[PDB]
Amino acid sequence: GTRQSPINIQWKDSVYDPQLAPLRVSYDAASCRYLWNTGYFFQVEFDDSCEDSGISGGPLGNHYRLKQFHFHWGATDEWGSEHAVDGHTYPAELHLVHWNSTKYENYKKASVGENGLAVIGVFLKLGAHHQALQKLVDVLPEVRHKDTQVAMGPFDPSCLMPACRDYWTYPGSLTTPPLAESVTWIVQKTPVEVSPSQLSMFRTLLFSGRGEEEDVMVNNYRPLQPLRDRKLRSSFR
Amino acid sequence: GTRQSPINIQWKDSVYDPQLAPLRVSYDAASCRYLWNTGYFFQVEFDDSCEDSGISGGPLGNHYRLKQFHFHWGATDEWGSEHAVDGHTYPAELHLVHWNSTKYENYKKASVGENGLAVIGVFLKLGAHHQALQKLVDVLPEVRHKDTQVAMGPFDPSCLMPACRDYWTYPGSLTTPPLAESVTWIVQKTPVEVSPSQLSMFRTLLFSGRGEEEDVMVNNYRPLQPLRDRKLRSSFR
Numbered sequence A, B: 001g002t003r004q005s006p007i008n009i010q011w012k013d014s015v016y017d018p019q020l021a022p023l024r025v026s027y028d029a030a031s032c033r034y035l036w037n038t039g040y041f042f043q044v045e046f047d048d049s050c051e052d053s054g055i056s057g058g059p060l061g062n063h064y065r066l067k068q069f070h071f072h073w074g075a076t077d078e079w080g081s082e083h084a085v086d087g088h089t090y091p092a093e094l095h096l097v098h099w100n101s102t103k104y105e106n107y108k109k110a111s112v113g114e115n116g117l118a119v120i121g122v123f124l125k126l127g128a129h130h131q132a133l134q135k136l137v138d139v140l141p142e143v144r145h146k147d148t149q150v151a152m153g154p155f156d157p158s159c160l161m162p163a164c165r166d167y168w169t170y171p172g173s174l175t176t177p178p179l180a181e182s183v184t185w186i187v188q189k190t191p192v193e194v195s196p197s198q199l200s201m202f203r204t205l206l207f208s209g210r211g212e213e214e215d216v217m218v219n220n221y222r223p224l225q226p227l228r229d230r231k232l233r234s235s236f237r
């Protein structure tokens, strides 16, 4: 395994690649479906048949379809993010996962193939109350046990991203099994603020199903993996 | 003595503490001074005046300054470690000793008091040759007799630690006289490989000084002690 995520994003190792095309993000909100507890974190699932919903530009050769998005977090506000910036970790991290619709026939096989997925990573930090996030925070009480679902209405994932879209990018892997190295990571440089009360609600979920011992959902992040010999390109000077 | 070490680390006694902060380890390789034969095992000494080389995070209330680190081995590659994991004992064990510079003015005092020390125990196992260890091995013929010392060039202890830093922690005592209960133990779940040649070299050391009869240095480990009612908490689940 020589391309594992996450990594400590260090400025001293990043190189500005001016030839990076702008990143075009446009998601079809009406394709949102359900929110569910996976046993690890909670995901928000979308209908990826709508080729219109997805991502392109940046370091991608073509358009990648939005499949789902999840978050990672810790037992306290001091830690929880998977990536670190200069060795600094944030209380949480959102992951928008998109798949290669031209190279792969479906998401299952994109997930494990070379250049099969493209994931945007957004750090979350404490600050102001975040309006759009609240739509999700609001249904968490119905998805406390593993494998449990809730229906979701229209939700636009772009509303979770920051205004400043500067990012770093590098070839990596999934941070969950099987840890396939099928991912083009697009880590946004600027974090979005959420309130502690919103973030607190996240630690209310459980790793356990119903009937089992109460096993709280916290510290669902993978430890830092070394860059090895990877080119960590920045889209900003 | 209620909190004596070493102990047998059994998973049935383990309780995951998700409140443990990430364990930061950063050593100033440059503070390495000499390597000497103590009469019991061999020990690499550091210059502890550097308020930077040491550890923090995990179960510590603060920064603990690196002092030294030694090894424990047996007469054969079948036993040698002090601690055991579910009854399994490894060929050898490394201990990285740090003292509480916040509470104690110096190491001699820290080693016999309150929360004076924090030690990282790493298990060595037969396997791949270890590059970082070789530097150590390369100087052993110089310290074959007790109280012998050889100056050391810049050396980094982390090169002896495992990539994965999951650990067990519990309060304990020194495993050499005075056997003081001043040690917060941090034992790394993941063993580090070394070849038989490197481990074979450990066995050419002597308990005896120069002029004396040759009393080989082997089996310099304390026997297992009862856990009693202590909390053996793990950083992993």
Ligand SMILES: [Zn+2]
Pocket: A070, A071, A072, A095, A175
């Ligand atoms: Zn993720």
Ligand SMILES: [Zn+2]
Pocket: B070, B071, B072, B095, B175
């Ligand atoms: Zn020791």
